[PDB]
Amino acid sequence: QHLEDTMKNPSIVGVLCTDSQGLNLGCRGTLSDEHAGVISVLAQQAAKLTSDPTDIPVVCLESDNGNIMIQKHDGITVAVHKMA
Amino acid sequence: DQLGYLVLSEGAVLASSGDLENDEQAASAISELVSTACGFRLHRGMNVPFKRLSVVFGEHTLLVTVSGQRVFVVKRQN
């Protein structure tokens, strides 16, 4: 998907995919298996804040040590660490 | 601009305005999320997880900062 492009992206220093089930579905760089659960939870929780099924909720931790962006897609959760 | 306001303390609700007022379900949902988020460590002994926490949707978007046991939330358009 765009997923491949995310993985190939040199502006992104970490990425992790997961499920509502919190399994590690593929990571890279600064994100690893340890983070699966939490990112999963985060995404699921944010999706409880909208009732519109067309929304793609996005959780964004802004930090001086780079930003973390978590999108809840249907069937998959993508987390991205940008050294911005 | 501002669609609503929420501020929590110790986990309980301290103040609320706009869309966020008289909405327990939202309050506790946001509290849950924030707590989870605060429990996020990139590396070992990596604090704080975030300076700013956002949750963006189609039209609405929540903006959260945390200071002590006090949590501040706004609802915004765009």
Side-chain angles (χ1 to χ4, degrees), chain A residues 21-32:
Chain A
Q21 297 314 327
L23 277 309
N24 181 357
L25 293 189
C27 67
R28 193 262 270 170
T30 66
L31 300 165
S32 41

Side-chain angles (χ1 to χ4, degrees), chain B residues 34-52:
Chain B
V34 175
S35 293
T36 305
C38 290
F40 184 92
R41 308 277 174 262
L42 207 282
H43 276 91
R44 178 91 93 195
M46 205 91 277
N47 287 254
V48 274
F50 59 85
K51 61 194 186 268
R52 219 176 296 107

Side-chain angles (χ1 to χ4, degrees), chain A residues 35 45 55 58 60 62 64, chain B residues 32 36 42 51-52 54 56 58:
Chain A
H35 310 103
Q45 280 173 326
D55 259 323
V58 169
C60 183
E62 295 158 85
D64 288 338
Chain B
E32 272 181 11
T36 305
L42 207 282
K51 61 194 186 268
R52 219 176 296 107
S54 333
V56 29

